[PDB]
From a paper:
Here we show that a rhoptry-resident kinase [name] is a key virulence factor that plays a crucial role in host cell entry. Cryo-EM, kinase assays, phosphoproteomics and cellular analyses reveal that [name] is a secretory pathway kinase of atypical structure that phosphorylates rhoptry proteins including the components of the RON complex. [name] is a 153 kDa type II transmembrane protein with a putative serine/threonine kinase domain and a large luminal carboxy-terminal extension (CTE) with no identifiable structural motif. Ultimately, [name] kinase activity controls host cell invasion by anchoring the moving junction at the parasite-host cell interface.
The canonical HRD catalytic triad of ePKs differs in [name] with an HFD motif conserved among all the coccidian orthologues of [name]. In addition, ATP hydrolysis activity was detected. The catalytic activity was completely abolished by introducing a single amino acid change (D595A) in the catalytic HFD motif (rRON13dk), validating the importance of this conserved kinase motif for enzymatic activity. To gain insight into the function and regulation of [name] kinase, its three-dimensional structure was resolved at 3.1 Å resolution by single-particle cryo-EM. The [name] kinase domain is similar to ePKs, but contains an α-helical N-lobe insertion (NLI) present exclusively in [name] coccidian orthologues. Unlike ROPKs that also reside in the rhoptries, [name] lacks an α-helical N-terminal extension. The kinase C-lobe structure contains all the motifs required for ATP transfer to the substrate, as well as a ROPK-specific disulfide bond. The CTE is mainly composed of α-helices clamping the kinase domain C-lobe. Of note, the CTE is essential for [name] folding and stability as neither expression of the kinase domain alone, nor proteolytic cleavage to separate the kinase domain from the CTE of rRON13 yielded a functional [name] kinase. Cleaved rRON13 behaved exactly as WT rRON13 when analyzed by size-exclusion chromatography, further emphasizing the strong interaction between [name] kinase domain and the CTE. Analysis of [name] electrostatic potential highlighted a rather extended positively charged groove lying on one side of the kinase that may be involved in protein–protein interactions, but did not provide strong hints to the role the CTE plays. Of interest, three autophosphorylation sites were identified on [name]: Thr379 and Ser381 within the NLI in proximity to the ATP-binding site (N-lobe) and Thr703 closer to the activation loop (C-lobe).
Residue numbers in the entry: 280 to 300, 307 to 784, 791 to 1186, 1201 to 1258, 1266 to 1310, 1319 to 1332, 1338 to 1349, 1356 to 1375
The structure:
Amino acid sequence: LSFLGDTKSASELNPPRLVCPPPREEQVRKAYALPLCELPWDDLGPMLGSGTFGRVYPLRRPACTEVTKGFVGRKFAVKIFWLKRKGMMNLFDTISQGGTPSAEQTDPGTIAAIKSEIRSLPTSSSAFRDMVRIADPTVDVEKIKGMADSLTVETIMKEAKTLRTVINTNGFYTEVGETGTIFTQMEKFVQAHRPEIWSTLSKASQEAQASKYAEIGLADNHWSLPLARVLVKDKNDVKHWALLIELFDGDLQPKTDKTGYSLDGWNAKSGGNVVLREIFSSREALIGLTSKLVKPFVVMQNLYSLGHFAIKPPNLLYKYFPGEKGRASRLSVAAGDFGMAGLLHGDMILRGTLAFMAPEMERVSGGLVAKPSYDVYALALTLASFWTAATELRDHYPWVEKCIKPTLKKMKDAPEFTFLRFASKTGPKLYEADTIYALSTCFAVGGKVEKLYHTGMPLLIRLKLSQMADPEPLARVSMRHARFVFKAYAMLDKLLRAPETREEQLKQLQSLHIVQFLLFYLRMEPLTAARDNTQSYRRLARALLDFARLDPVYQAATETVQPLPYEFFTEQKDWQNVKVEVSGSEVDETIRKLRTSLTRDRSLSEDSWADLVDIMFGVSLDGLREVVTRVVYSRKTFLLEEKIGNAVKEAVAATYKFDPNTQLIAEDAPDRLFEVVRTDLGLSYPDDSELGRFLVHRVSKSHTAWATVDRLARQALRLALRREERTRQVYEQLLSGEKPSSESEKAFFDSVFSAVSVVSEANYFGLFWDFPSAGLFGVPPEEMQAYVRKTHLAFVGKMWPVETQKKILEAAVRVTVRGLNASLPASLVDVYATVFAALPTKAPVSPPFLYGLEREEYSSLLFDAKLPEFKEMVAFWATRHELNIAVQTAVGKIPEGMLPAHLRSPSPARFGWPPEAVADNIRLFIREAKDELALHGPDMVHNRIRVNGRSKPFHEIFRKAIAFKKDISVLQFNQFFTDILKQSFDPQCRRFIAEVKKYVRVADTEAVAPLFDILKLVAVDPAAPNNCFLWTQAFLDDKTIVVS
């Protein structure tokens, strides 16, 4: 362990730790000495982007001969400084060009803005008195700070030509100071940590000295800084100031849709999305981007002292280089905007964007000093915004519309999530008690943001992003640690995936520090170049997840703290003034044990131990005294997490004992499980205490795990049915109703259990339950293989094919539309929302999952459809049945310009049809309603009949319409429903009789018409309460049953 004592002091491959904690004119005069160039308004092309301070222009007819020697490739673009605020530049233009402006644009707001902006002109500086002298040598800037306030500004009709230059040059001056404050800090670093460069800059340079910094910032560090000081000459001889920035494709933030027909908000025709949609949809490109995106900020924080305090998707710039033939697509990323950058541990000003502000900046932090932990939060949010983008892109971020705001609305009179309430000094805080818990839950495994992630995001990245966005300022990992783990995983994944460059890849891998410690800790050898190292990459990537689960700390705490006997949680009163407290003197014995276990009985110094814990766990030395306290608190309450984990997994078995065909378990707890568990254990905890919240937190955490086990067992079945035709034979045997031999069932279940491991491998490097987990599940991992094979594979054995899943869902969506009489909205998002929120109550069969708590795995498993395709599948069914219902009533009124107000000429994109199918589907609906009407007559009689329906933990009564003749008898009445039972979905009820009872059954000689209302229709078996009339397509449909 010789590399730990700060061996690489200024390297950019693995920077050192963050150990511990100028005039104004100097910073402006530093960056003001950049090369100047002049070009007219003819090399500039069409405008390409516009902000609040400037407009960017690409330059045609190449110019700026300072470039020909400069950076190869790397197209350029100027930006003219043009203040956009209350249309005052437009007013200045209309006055200068000629004519008189309107009095409507002038009076209150424009004059207010000019009055506010002519003051605060830094007329003291000597740089601002030369910037204005170069652009216009006739204006005397010392009279304009006086004329604005002596006589109020209404001389605007004669001072426009000067006000323009003054204001735009003040904008240029601010943007120049923003870069000077960085050139200063870069020079302060090149002195101490670069001997080769500072032997040719310190000798003699002032402009080359300031161009070298820009070259270093663009090429080495991946920032984006200005390179020249171009001065543009207009057609009317009015010079504007500008800067020569680099040109990217830019703005990793995609555009949203506005027509309302896209079920993921992606604008289908934005032109700039076509490439972004290729990045945010694949797994390899996203794994590469995640590691490429941390480099600039790691460099910025650990090498130089400054920090970047406005991180958000619009501020990151990209460059694609498609690489179609003979090469590969190489993505490049840079950091854009440097408006708020400042030295670390210096005083700061609260100015950011609200959705990305750390919660510890809310009231105060010693006057809000600039801490390094404010930047790790904003990258966790930014990266989570990239992994959930191809699934439900919205205009507002997920953690504020699903996690923060519905919590803020409940337990306070403060629904205002604004910046004025965030910055204010007086009032109720914004992140006080429950909003912090909601934010913590939002990113953990099972929350909303975590429900929206890609299917292919490994568990290591999920855990790391969950640890970077931690509301607690301590116990939050640093940027160096994140860079290490993400880069190591990207390298290992590219080695594993790919089938002369292997040598360079292996050297670049083993040159890291995290990998060298992992090789020392796993007892491994310097790997190879001529050996198949597959199982040695499998171990380095699996040992990198055990440190995210925090397994070494748990193994060190298992040997120190005892488990707090079970007679503590049942034999104590006053449950509001007791709480499991950690001694504070054992959180030190566990740390000593951990140090000895990790170092392997060598003797490190203190700096080496600090560096090692920062590399491996990513915290300070007084920052692991909270990680360790969490672990030993979780170890004290053993024997209560285990009893809870065992109380559930019997609810999961009762679910299959009561409803023997469910098709999912649906991770979110059914809100009734808590009362089952609290009564199962015999507990009585006041719901507002350290133990009531603990119990409600553990019940859901165990239910999510058991639902995950169920889902993996259901995916393995569908994977093993795709191969091994013998498995398919036995599966069809099971489904058809009969039963197979014993050895055939054994082979079937053995194949499914062998496929469980193939399914579990991708996201969890190994099995799902293959870690120390006996408080999460109720079963130690040694007895977990023998539970899934013998017990759980019998629940999920007979699972309906996909066509049946789609048919019953279609028929349950076409009943909700009859149930609710109102019409449907205009945008398909709202149609889906209403139809799928009113579905559990008005449908006979309950859906497998609820609205808002839906996932991509559920849909891809049950329906073979992604989430934005599942929603689009539901909306079309809804709208088409709406059109059918509208045509039926109109055909009824006629003894057709009498359709409702928004169906006379609808766009065939509201349906799924092409433009040629609507005028035929209407004719089909007409030809069908004609028969539905011809049904009615004097002889026929219509009524409803009662059967058993949904199974609530006895059954509901469910009544279905019937139409028959008066001549019919019970003889011919029972035979029809017997023949209907033959096509049931439930394989058990394919052999039943379907008598009609009153429960005294009726004589077969009686008539049916005089009996019609207490009689019900039951299914009895001829050999020996069931609801297996509900599982038929005749009883699930809308049309009435025609008994005939």
